Amino acid sequence: TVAPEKHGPVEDMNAIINALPTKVDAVKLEYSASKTNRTNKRPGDGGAPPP
Amino acid sequence: PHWMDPQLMGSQTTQYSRNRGYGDPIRGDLPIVPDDGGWFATRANPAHHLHTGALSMIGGDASDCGSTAVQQLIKKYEDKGCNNNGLNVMSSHYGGVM
Amino acid sequence: PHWMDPQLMGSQTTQYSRNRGYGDPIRGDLPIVPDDGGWFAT
Amino acid sequence: TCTTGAGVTSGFIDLATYDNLDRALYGGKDATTYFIKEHYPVGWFTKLPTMATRVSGNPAFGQEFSVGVPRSGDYVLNAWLTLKTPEIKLLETNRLGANGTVRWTKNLMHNAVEHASLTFNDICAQQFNTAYLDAWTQFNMCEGKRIGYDNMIGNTSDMTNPTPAQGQDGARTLPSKNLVLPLPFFFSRDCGLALPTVVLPYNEIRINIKLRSLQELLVFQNKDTGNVIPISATDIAGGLADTVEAYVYMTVGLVSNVERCAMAGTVRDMVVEQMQAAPTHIVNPQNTNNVHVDMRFSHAVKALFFMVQNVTYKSVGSNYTCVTPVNGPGNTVMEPAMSVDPIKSASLTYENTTRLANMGVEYYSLVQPWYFSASIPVYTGYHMYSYALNVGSVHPSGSTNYGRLTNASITVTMSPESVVAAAGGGNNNSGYNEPQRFALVVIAVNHNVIRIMNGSMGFPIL
Amino acid sequence: CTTGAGVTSGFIDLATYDNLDRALYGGKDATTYFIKEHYPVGWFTKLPTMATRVSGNPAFGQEFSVGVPRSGDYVLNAWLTLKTPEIKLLETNRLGANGTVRWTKNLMHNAVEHASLTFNDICAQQFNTAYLDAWTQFNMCEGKRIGYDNMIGNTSDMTNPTPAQGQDGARTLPSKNLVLPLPFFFSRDCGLALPTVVLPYNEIRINIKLRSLQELLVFQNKDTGNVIPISATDIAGGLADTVEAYVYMTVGLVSNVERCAMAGTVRDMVVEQMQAAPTHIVNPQNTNNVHVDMRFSHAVKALFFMVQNVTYKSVGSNYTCVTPVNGPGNTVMEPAMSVDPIKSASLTYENTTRLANMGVEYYSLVQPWYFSASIPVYTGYHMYSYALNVGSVHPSGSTNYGRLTNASITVTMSPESVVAAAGGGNNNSGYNEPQRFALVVIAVNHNVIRIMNGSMGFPIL
Amino acid sequence: VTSGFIDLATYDNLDRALYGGKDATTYFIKEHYPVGWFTKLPTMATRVSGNPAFGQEFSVGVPRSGDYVLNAWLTLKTPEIKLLETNRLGANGTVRWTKNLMHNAVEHASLTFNDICAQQFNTAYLDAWTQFNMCEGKRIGYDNMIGNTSDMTNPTPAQGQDGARTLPSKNLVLPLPFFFSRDCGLALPTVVLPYNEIRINIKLRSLQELLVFQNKDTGNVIPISATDIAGGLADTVEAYVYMTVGLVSNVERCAMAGTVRDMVVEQMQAAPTHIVNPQNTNNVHVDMRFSHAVKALFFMVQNVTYKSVGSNYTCVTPVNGPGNTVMEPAMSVDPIKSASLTYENTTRLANMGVEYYSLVQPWYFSASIPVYTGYHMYSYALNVGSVHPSGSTNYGRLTNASITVTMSPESVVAAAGGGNNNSGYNEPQRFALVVIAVNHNVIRIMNGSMGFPIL
Incomplete structure (x- = not known):
């Protein structure tokens, strides 16, 4: 005659879910590193000026 | 919060009689008013007696x-x-019995 | 400073249909306006 | 040019071939392009299998048992029955002696399961049985999964292979391996149609399954004459254990709290597919060749499956050919040379106004499945006629309503092969060594509407 | 506690939420499953009908036409049924005891050549055996393969050779009717259908030409494996030219409220046609490289090419350098030396190699694996498609050979083909007699058809 | 003919609810919309490093100057095999190509962006994917292009015996499953990545591990040697890479020039293999350490007794049956009996039977069911093969998770030898448990560079 109430499991959530931002900081650092240009846009140049 | 809720919710569809099965599938039966009387008069319902x-x-x-x-x-x-050339024709009549 | 510049550098000459290799090689074809329409029109 | 390895320059000589004919098909401001897939977010949800709790009966052959659908699951969309087959070991003390073999019937699953019903409260939401199971699995079968389906339900060339007595050369015994049968339900047909158990806290869902006794599950065949006689407990070692374990598993889904709160407390309309089975009829080709059966269905019928089933031996099942299978060389099962469907032609009648003429049997067998189905049957029989463009699609397609339609009839014509098979006189290993009998079964599939509101479920039209 | 009914285990998965999950799922307007949106569709009905011929009679080796009838609203199906005669060999055959007669492989797709659909008096659409075979091999939906191989013959009851009456094998070939669905633009998809009610000012006709029983039946020598034409004397009961064939089509009726709307309007439909290049005789003995110049007009979509064995007219649908021969068990078998003659192929647009000298296996396997719905289960049948999906009715990448200038295809034969062209083969080897091959090219193209003023015509001519 | 009128006349409340309406769409009329003008053509892949040979790794650069590369495959020319009479096994010796010739001789095929590895795959992933998501009709063609044509896998005796056949040297084609090859809507924007470097590395396997040298009677396998066969074990091989490029119209090329593009892709990650000994234990725990939102998990135990024979997920090795053919003994079943998942002492998935993972899960959430023993899968999504995202859980926000696998009596009895001739388990057998996971990720393209904004 009443709507059943559903909640979380018996075990606490935090022990399983945990919290450690090392992965996301690693991703952000990798993205910031890749933001700078790493390829060459002057092929067949020889960018050494004459002495 | 009780039983019989689906049966109270539902509505039965129209149930016709065996007389309707003899009607004309193409054109419907003519509108006839039943005789509502108390002496040898059938109180037939056109809703489930007519096609x-x-x-x-x-x-x-x-x-x-x-x-x-x-x-x-x-x-x-x-x-x-x-x-001019030929035997002359008349327009065909398509209207049916005025 | 980008790719595809060598092949977008210029243009490319027009290519003719198979119908061109049939007319007079000495005198030009007569100037005939084409047919424009939506019913059996080329 | 140059016919280089990374030839891209040759890809412009055809891009330049643009004119009026393809100007209509390609190009434009609104012309969409490939290589760029549009993205759109979807809902957040999880799914996991759950064991279904029992409420009534005991799982045993020939008895009925019920299973209750658990609550607190936001949705349920799956259902399958797992059952461990027993071990069969023929004994030399059998009635037929050395000339006798025992084998499981063809399609072990779809057998020993009939009148499988899904009911809310005490109102039957729907139900199906062996004929519908066979017709659906033969008409709407997805390729690639055909081998898996023909492996999970028997027919693995191991259960159906006859085994002689212990004293004979073939002393192998039938293994005891569990089998799985998915249950075709309206919520299992599509993901978009699932039971909202979160919205239905007042109704009591229930699934009822009635099994069959092992006597009609085991086929006991004479090796030489190809005659089938009922099996007995003393014939095989270990007896006939009536009780056997059987479980029902279903998959539930969980949605987000915000989504469930938003969708809680509203009216919903669902379109479902059901079954209507006409009462069986007995056909005797020796007396008359034409058999008429009247259909009395209610809702908008979508397709009609009509088949003639051989009913000579009650043990054998899913045999829709006029001649029963017999034992063959190599301790295998094979069908005799004269093994064809008994239906020659069929027609429909709507108050002596034939919708369909005396169309050939091959029409229903091949042309209709080729055009309006996802598969074509590989066995004899399985005749259909569908009013819809696509039977397997859950979206509504062309159909007629039998509620306002006056009593319709189907007329079938027998075949000379059926007539000659009805009488006996056949020689050994011919299948028709005994007089044969057949039955007519008709199945219809119809649409229906279910209303979900006020925490309860029910048909708005009944 | 641990139980099999534990539902709360999914709450951990639900709680495992981060930025990636926020990007992938969720949102104010995020769609959801378990809720199927329903929209109303049109009201209609369908039923099959018989088409009554008004010109000629169905006879083997002749051509007959059938008029598509009005009184429907949408014609979307068309198939042809034909009842084969009963064949029984006689001991008086000119091959004597060493004589077997059997139906040709792919009985249907044979005895139907240049099947055409015309409106009024316009040469509108046509197809033939090569197109039928290529399409059925490249766009075959699985599960229906057995149905098709029972509908169009190849049921192992007509393709299995039978000896004479005197010998052990005296069975007669069964006489059962066969059905073939005619491929047409309206039959390709339900979206495209013929507005027959909207077209009262045109006559729609379907023309079918049949082959001869001499070209159909195969008379094979049991030992040496040589094929010779059949004669009416050998077949018991004589040879009958007439045959019982019929045409059926499914029509669809609609309500008057939407029947009134389609009256007096202009419609444009996208259809698919085919062009068959004239066959080119190929002699591997002299030259192993063959050049063929195409001549196509509209926007081509795919190109199917094959090399067909043409040594015997009785045997058909063979694309291998070695003909099948009688084998053990009164069956027909293809000998071990059996490979497709084509070794490589290339395309050229005005001395410009558009497609390099790719191997035959490329066209045989890689292209079907990527741009078609099926891969052929037979030798030959090489495909090259300009579109992502060949079977899709919706247009995709394509080129118009009419706008393009002249184009050519170069093919290379194989050592097996060049050594099988000559005779010298022993008994039941296939190449016991000199072999000849021909190259056939089929192209599939798009087109536009305009319906207006109760008439149909090409808006582009 | 006129019964259609009677059928149409039957219009009721249910028929009005389903059909009908002013806004209801109708069949027999299809709305047509234009599509972008484009073209496509195959191209060769330019070799950049090494020489393709067995047992070595060779590199290829993806060609530039296209607009959208969307398809990749590799063609390899197999050598000729000719068994001699001087073999170590003598007359009782046969040589055949290993089962699944393709998906073998290819170890850790990798695609890398610039100098950052984009993704890679290997034999187990290839086998699982091609066994689970194999569209029918193309199954025969795929088998033919990868081998298994009763020519490579049929044992051939020495030249002095009845079977003098030689394995033909015919080229084979292996498609490369990559994120751009998953769908036509996902392709590398080479027009957006100018002067960038796209690298593809393939490490072929040594030819000694691709030839199965089986004894005729006892069913034993020993490694092959150059002196066994005529000519010799030619290390060099003829391998080529072909990729399909596409060209787009100039207007749509210029329209999308200079903008950010976000793409959703799928990748694979494999846990390290663990040697399992059923003779000692029965239940084994494996710790799964994955990173991103996983979509599917494929786990199976592989028989690793002989390095020569591969793709054998059965407790008993195949033997040489009659007619110079390969066969499997009657004792050929998958060694896995049950499996379960656990979240640090919280059983999410109970001890379900092996048949569940083998059949029921593929029947519901896959496009095909495997035809060989093994290939156990579990999917968190409704459709594994669908490119569009579905249900998935990310292991980054999850602590250590474990998988428990139970062996079988057949496996434990096969782990000890003593079997008869041609029984397969004549010698003790070794098994290794391999687990792979298919997960999602996001790629961002900006300023001619590729990176992972959130990875």
Whole structure:
């Protein structure tokens, strides 16, 4: 005659879910590193000026 | 919060009689008012004693469909007045019994 | 400073249909306006 | 040019071939392009299998048992029955002696399961049985999964292979391996149609399954004459254990709290597919060749499956051919040379106004499945006629309503092969060594509407 | 506690939420499953009908036409049924005891050549055996393969050779009717259908030409494996030219409320046609490289090419350098030396190699694996498609050979083909007699058809 | 003919609810919309490093100057095999190509962006994917292009015996499953990545591990040697890479020039293999350490007794049956009996039977069911093969998770030898448990560079 109430499991959530931002900081650092240009846009140049 | 909720919610569909099965599938039965009396008069219900018929979908006569919009085009596109060469013809009559 | 510049550098000459290799090689074809329409028109 | 390895320059000589004919098909401001897939987010949800709790009966052959659908699951969309088959070991003390073999019937699953019903409260939401199971699995079968389906339900060339007695050369015994049968339900047909158990806290869902006794599950065939006689407990070692374990598993889904709160407390309309089975009829080709059966269905019928089933031996099942299978060389099962469907032609009648003429049997067998189904049956029988463009699609397609239609009839014509098979006189290993009998079964599939509101479920039209 | 009914285990998965999950799922307007949106569709009905011929009679080796009838609203199906005669060999055959007669492989797709659909008097659409075979091999939906191989013959009851009456094998070939669905633009998809009610000012006709029983039946020598034409004397009961064939089509009726709307309007439909290049005789003995110049007009979509063995007219649908021969068990078998003659192929647009000298296996396997719905289960049948999906009715990448200038295809034969062209083969080897091959090219193209003023015509000519 | 009128006349409340309406769409009329003008053509892949040979790794650069590369495959020319009479096994010796010749001789095929590895795959992933998501009709063609044509896998005796056949040297084609090859809507924007470097590395396997040298009677396998066969074990091989490029119209090329593009892709990650000994234990725990939102998990135990024979997920090795053919003994079943998942002492998935993972899960959430023993899968999504995202859980926000696998009596009895001739388990057998996971990720393209904004 009443709507059943559903909640979380018996075990606490935090022990399983945990919290450690090392992965996301690693991703952000990798993205910031890749933001700078790493390829060459002057092929067949020889960018050494004459002495 | 109790049983019989689905049966109270549902509504039974119309149940016809065996007499309706003998009707005309194409055109429906004519509208006849039953005799509501207390002496040898059947109180038949036309709702489940009458056949509506198939004419509702087929019949037009409102839009360009239907016969009443084809005779005008036929007459307009039909050549009239002498023949010159041949034996002369008369326009076909399509209206049925005035 | 980008790719595809070598092949977008210029243009490319027009290519003719198979019908061109049939007329007079000495005198030009008569100037005939084409047919434009939506019913059996080339 | 140059016919280089990374030839891209040759890809412009055809891009330059643009004119009026393809100007209509390609190009434009609104012309969409490939290589760029539009993205759109979807809902957040999880799914996991759950064991279904029992409420009534005991799982045993020939008895009925019920299973209750658990609550607190936001949705349920799956259902399958797992059952461990027993071990069969023929004994030399059998009635037929050395000339006798025992084998499981063809399609072990779809057998020993009939009148499988899903009911809310005490109102039957729907139900199906062996004929519908066979017709659906033969008409709407997805390729690639055909081998898996023909492996999970028997027919693995191991259960159906006859085994002689212990004293004979073939002393192998039938293994005891569990089998799985998915249950075709309206919520299992599509993901978009699932039971909202979160919205239905007042109704009591229930699934009822009635099994069959092992006597009609085991086929006991004479090796030489190809005659089938009922099996007995003393014939095989270990007896006939009536009780056997059987479980029902279903998959539930969980949605987000915000989504469930938003969708809680509203009216919903669902379109479902059901079954209507006409009562069986007995056909005797020796008396008359034409058999008429009247259909009395209610809702908008979508397709009609009509088949003639051989009913000579009650043990054998899913045999829709006029001649029963017999033992063959190599201790295998094979069908005799004269093994064809008994239906020659069929027609429909709507108040002596035949919708269909005396169309050939091959029409229903091949042309209709080729055009309006996802598969074509590989066995004899399985005749259909569908009013819809696509039977397997859950979206509504062309159909007629039998509620306002006056009593319709189907007329079938027998075949000379059926007539000659009805009488006996056949020689050994011919299948028709005994007089044969057949039955007519008709199945219809119809649409229906279910209303979900006020924490309860029910048909708005009944 | 641990139980099999534990539902709360999914709450951990639900709680495992981060930025990636926020990007992938969720949102104010995020769609959801378990809720199927329903929209109303049109009201209609369908039923099959018989088409009554008004010109000629169905006879083997002749051509007959059938008029598509009005009184429907949408024609979307068309198939042809034909009842084969009963064949029984006689001991008086000119091969004597060493004589077997059997139906040709792919009985249907044979005895139907240049099947055409015309409106009024316009040469509108046509197809033939090569197109039928290529399409059925490249766009075959699985599960229906057995149905098709029962509908169009190849049921192992007509393709299995039978000896004479005197010998052990005296069975007669069964006489059962066969059905073939005619491929047409309206039959390709339900979206495209013929507005027959909207077209009252045109006559729609379907023309079918049949082959001869001499070209159909195969008379094979049991030992040496040589094929010779059949004669009416050998077949018991004589040879009958007439045959019982019929045409059926499914029509669809609609309500008047939407029947009135389609009256007096202009419609444009996208259809698919085919062009068959004239066959080119190929002699591997002299030259192993063959050049063929195409001549196509509209926007081509795919190109199917094959090399067909043409040594015997009785045997058909063979694309291998070695003909099948009688084997053990009164069956027909293809000998071990059996490979497709084509070794490589290339395309050229005005001395410009558009397609390099790719191997035959490329066209045989890689292209079907990527741009078609099926891969052929037979030798030959090489495909090259300009579109992502060959079977899709919707247009995709394509080129118009009419706008393009002249184009050519170069093919290379194989050592097996060049050594099988000559005779010298022993008994039941296939190449016991000199072999000849021909190259056939089929192209599939798009087109536009305009319906207006109760008439149909090409808007581009 | 006229019964259609009777059928149409039957219009009721249910028929009005389903059909009908002013806004209801109708069949027999299809709305047509234009599509972008484009073209496509195959191209060769330019070799950049090494020489393709067995047992070595060779590199290829993806060609530039296209607009959208969307398809990749590799063609390899197999050598000729000719067994001699001087073999170590003598007359009782046969040589055949290993089962699944393709998906073998290819170890850790990798695609890398610039100098950052984009993704890679290997034999187990290839086998699982091609066994689970194999569209029918193309199954025969795929088998033919990868081998298994009763020519490579049929044992051939020495030249002095009845079977003098030699394995033909015919080229084979292996498609490369990559994120751009998953769908036509996902392709590398080479027009958006100018002067960038796209690298593809393939490490072929040594030819000694691709030839199965089986004894005729006892069913034993020993490694092959150059002196066994005529000519010799030619290390060099003829391998080529072909990729399909596409060209787009100039207007749509210029329209999308200079903008950010976000793409959703799928990748694979494999846990390290663990040697399992059923003779000692029965239940084994494996710790799964994955990173991103996983979509599917494929786990199976592989028989690793002989390095020569591969793709054998059965407790008993195949033997040489009659007619110079390969066969499997009657004792050929998958060694896995049950499996379960656990979230640090919280059983999410109970001890379900092996048949569940083998059949029921593929029947519901896959496009095909495997035809060989093994290939156990579990999917968090409704459709594994669908490119569009579905249900998935990310292991980054999850602590250590474990998988428990139970062996079988057949496996434990096969782990000890003593079997008869041609029984397969004549010698003790070794098994290794391999687990792979298919997960999602996001790629961002900006300023001619590729990176992972959130990875």
